[PDB]
Write a protein that binds this ligand. Structure first.
Ligand code: 2NF
Ligand SMILES: *[C@@H]1O[C@H](CO)[C@@H](O[C@@H]2O[C@H](CO)[C@@H](O)[C@H](O)[C@H]2NC(C)=O)[C@H](O)[C@H]1NC(C)=O
Ligand SMILES: *[C@@H]1O[C@H](CO)[C@@H](O[C@@H]2O[C@H](CO)[C@@H](O)[C@H](O)[C@H]2NC(C)=O)[C@H](O)[C@H]1NC(C)=O
Lengths: 238, 237
């Protein structure tokens, strides 16, 4: 197919419904009950048969309202450029990243796109964010989910950043661009800049990029505590 | 066209929306960054103009709510039902926030609006009454959409000001009842303040039908509940 991105995950619909069952029954049973058939149907309806490069935030409002990415106060974890580590940290400390919310869990690691005049997914290729269009259903999903995740944050939240990069805070990242500026006001944020096993840090809490982050948080009336110069192992020990 | 049961659209609706948006974003609650009030007003108009006033859906307000979500800091939220004036004077004095203190709630408070298919203008003549005409009207749908997100957004300790004075301080069919209470997140703690007129005595209290009503809803959602009754209008304020 013509897009520069990999095609939709095979059997997407089955995966998201089975993941929904597993999540609602065995991961976060609670609660209030949710219909996973309805959630799957809402997920498909958001993007199926639509122009794969005209995704808007508004296409996802209904899906999100069925299961907002809300995490109990003091359990929320943000991350940027630290995928593996942040999730290991969350899993071990019993915390929740975006990928641990119902909708994040459904979509984590999946790919999807549709095609006008078709009720099927495009399993051949999907729009690439850089080569094709930013406004694609995969990228917009994560942007909008990220935004609501940031909005619903409460009490103490933590963020895991990459101390082996020149700028641990990337203002063009999803964290920098969508999450930090939408963080609920008056929450408290603790940041951990963590470096490879490995090697001396390339960024710190005193670096320019973190000062940029503090400036955004000052604006959101968010108290900020930053810790750095820790290796992955040292971090996971504290 | 004057066929509906409800008062027509507020005259100057568009001007009023723009003025209030400027006031809110510049003088009341300046944000950490700017919101484009022209864009907000355009989105508000586009939601309903030239549409069947009885075919409103929540989706019609997606763009608008995305421009200005009615969310606020934990512990800040004041809910109300049948206690508008009291609740708002309460909120003001304690520097808390009702829905009407959010950007969109502030824009829309006390206004009416509806359109008519094939017309680019508001219907100044009449608009659908939510009882006598249709529930799916742009005025009722707006408040339900806003109310739901505001309730969703609540965290830590939040409060609701009830009246009674009424045989049922908690009306299960009010917006608070259908839409707010049932959308509070688990572990949120709701304080209910049953305030009678003062005024001769009450009519309802933290014991009654109406509450086993509310409390029941909170239970089963995992919302903690504190009910303070036997309070007057002067005590409370
Ligand atoms: N500012 C407002 O006009 C407003 C309207 C509706 C709802 N709210 C939000 O919900 C709560 C109050 O609504 P309520 O229905 O619990 O309280 P009432 O005093 O019973 O009603 C307030 C106004 O809403 C109207 N109302 C109630 N149900 C509907 C409906 N289904 N459709 C249109 N209007 C309705 C009602 O007639 C009254 O003028 C309050 O916490 C606030 F957050 C605000
Ligand atoms: C900080 O960022 C770097 C760059 O992304 C990460 O290193 C990559 O990690 C992946 C996943 O293990 C490897 O497959 C790549 O080979 C690595 N790329 C490079 C350029 O080294 C690193 O894991 C991050 N560090 C922390 C502490 O999260
Ligand atoms: C409880 O409900 C009653 C009835 O709505 C409220 O009384 C009204 O208040 C307004 C504003 O002062 C008056 O103009 C109306 O005449 C009143 N209506 C009736 C039927 O009395 C009363 O304000 C509410 N009490 C509290 C504590 O909010």
């Amino acid at each position: 197919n013509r897009w520069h991105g990999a095609g939709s995950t095979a059997d997407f619909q089955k995966i998201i419904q089975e993941r929904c069952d597993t999540y609602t029954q065995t991961i976060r049973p609670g609660s209030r009950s949710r219909n996973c058939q309805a959630i799957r149907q809402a997920f498909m309806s958001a993007f199926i048969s639509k122009d794969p490069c005209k995704a808007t935030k508004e296409d996802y409002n209904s899906l999100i309202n069925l299961a907002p990415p809300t995490v109990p106060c003091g359990q929320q974890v943000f991350w940027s450029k630290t995928k593996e580590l942040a999730h290991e940290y969350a899993k071990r400390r019993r915390l929740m990243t975006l990928e641990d919310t119902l909708l994040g869990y459904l979509a984590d690691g999946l790919r999807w796109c549709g095609e006008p005049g078709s009720s099927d997914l495009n399993i051949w290729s999907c729009p690439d964010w850089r080569k094709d269009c930013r406004t694609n259903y995969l990228s917009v999903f994560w942007e909008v989910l990220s935004e609501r995740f940031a909005e619903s944050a409460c009490n103490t939240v933590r963020v895991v950043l990459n101390g082996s990069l020149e700028n641990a805070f990337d203002s063009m990242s999803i964290f920098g661009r969508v999450q930090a500026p939408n963080l609920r006001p008056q929450v408290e944020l603790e940041a951990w800049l963590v470096h490879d096993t490995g090697k001396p840090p390339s960024d710190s809490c005193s670096g320019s990029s973190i000062r940029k982050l503090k400036s955004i948080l000052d604006g959101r009336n968010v108290k900020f505590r930053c810790m750095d110069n820790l290796s992955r192992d040292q971090f996971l020990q504290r």
